Design a protein around this ligand. Sequence first.
Ligand SMILES: [Mg+2]
Lengths: 48, 224, 226, 48, 53
Amino acid sequence: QKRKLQVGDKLANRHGNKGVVAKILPVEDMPHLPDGTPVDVILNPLGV
Amino acid sequence: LKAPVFTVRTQGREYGEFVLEPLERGFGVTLGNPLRRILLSSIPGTAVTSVYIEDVLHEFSTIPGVKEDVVEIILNLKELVVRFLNPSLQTVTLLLKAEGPKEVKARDFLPVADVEIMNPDLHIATLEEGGRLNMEVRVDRGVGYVPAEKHGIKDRINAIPVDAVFSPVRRVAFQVEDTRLGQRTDLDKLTLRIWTDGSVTPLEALNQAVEILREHLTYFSNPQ
Amino acid sequence: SKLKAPVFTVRTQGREYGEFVLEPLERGFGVTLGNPLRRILLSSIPGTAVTSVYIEDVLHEFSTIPGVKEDVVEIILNLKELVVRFLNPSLQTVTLLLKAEGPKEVKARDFLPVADVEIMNPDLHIATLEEGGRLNMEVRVDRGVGYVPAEKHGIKDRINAIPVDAVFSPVRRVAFQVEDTRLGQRTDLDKLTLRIWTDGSVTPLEALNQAVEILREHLTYFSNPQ
Amino acid sequence: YDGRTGEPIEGPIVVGQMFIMKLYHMVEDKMHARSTGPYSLITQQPLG
Amino acid sequence: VFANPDEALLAVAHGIVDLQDVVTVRYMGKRLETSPGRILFARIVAEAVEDEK
Ligand SMILES: [Mg+2]
């Protein structure tokens, strides 16, 4: 089977920050740069 | 405030700038944002939906004489841009027959009436001598993003469904500048920037988005 | 497989509050429609407001008058609560005259009547006078939209007149809500609720109809390039 | 900019590029439910 | 100087003042000297319990 990312999957970086995916948003809902480029991931600053 | 002037600047069939000025204070965001939301989500286009390759049973296999596997080949077919010249056309099937050694591009598809390929130089596969590729690609017309699990379209037994990304719009941004008219000084100047794939022009996409918003405004008419 | 047309229901009590519901909608269209209408409702609905006041024997805004409980600030704050409707479409600005003698309570109905001008809240309290109290006041009322501070327009009809903040907008508050709904096998649909507060000069249903027409008119400007 | 409203966030936000991994623990392999089923030999209690 | 919480919050929507700026607002018959955001917090509690006093 071919598995795509879904709500409940676990992600991490190399510095020990981990968490499960809780929400998937359509592209027009994401924050974007003034040139129209949207971001991919939103991380909480309260974990730092 | 007097009716604004509309200006259009276009670069080919893929980029365009649309300017509306002067506007009242705050109306640039009021008009710009809803158009951007509609443009990025509700504009119809075309996408590859199902592929059949001769002597291939599923997508987790390889083909003798071909450098790429079926998964990589399908990833290349999701970048194909097909333009229907007839508004009544809903589905077409493109045929390809090749023998190595050669690099097969999107221009190797057989010609079809009222169908145009917008990126003929798109690489598809690399054939070594002794390799063959005989495939049929089905292109549908639709709106939005539809995973292969939802439609499950197969024209024959061994066909492989493909995830469809129908939207022809690539990127949208809008600018708000500070203009003035005589004594009034806090007026807005609005510019819309639209990027498309070429099957639909930015001016065509803008007109279709304005009609979608106008249609929705009639829903506030009859209170039940 | 396009979605069916949604249903528009209303729940209005009195002339100052109403709730409006539209469902079902496509995914993300509750935000697409709620935000523009909210911005238009708070800045574009025509209305009337007080722009200047002249009081006899009063120099500046921070003083106090002998013989009346209220100071100059409180009287001005009460004038900003006054709701007045023009009955003449050509009428642009009017002045209201008030003369009072203590020890009565001055009300909004104590203003001298003006033709084609109506007071919507005649029971509004203005000031309280005592024995030996005088109040000679002149109030100027204009037409406009939005909210304009006093120091911006700076309107003074005569000498020693005090400009006041102009609360033109009849709409007092807007709040909209978006909820997830379902229709058979479709589960990402939208339901939009729109709640409007008004001062009574225009009904909340009237304000919504005007806001929709303003947005529709601006959409026809994408018509004739250059 | 906010995609839902078109208005900016009130303060500048830290934006950049980061390397993120998808871990072996997926919700697809972990969700389970039961009404009735096999029982133990001696204690006659449900299995685990 | 604002006559009620609605006027102060309408000025915020027009960008005249911020929620952290200290102003004069009339509320519940008293002339308070606070920010619009503290007046906003008071309305959150009042509507949740449906008893202003
Ligand atoms: Mg595409």
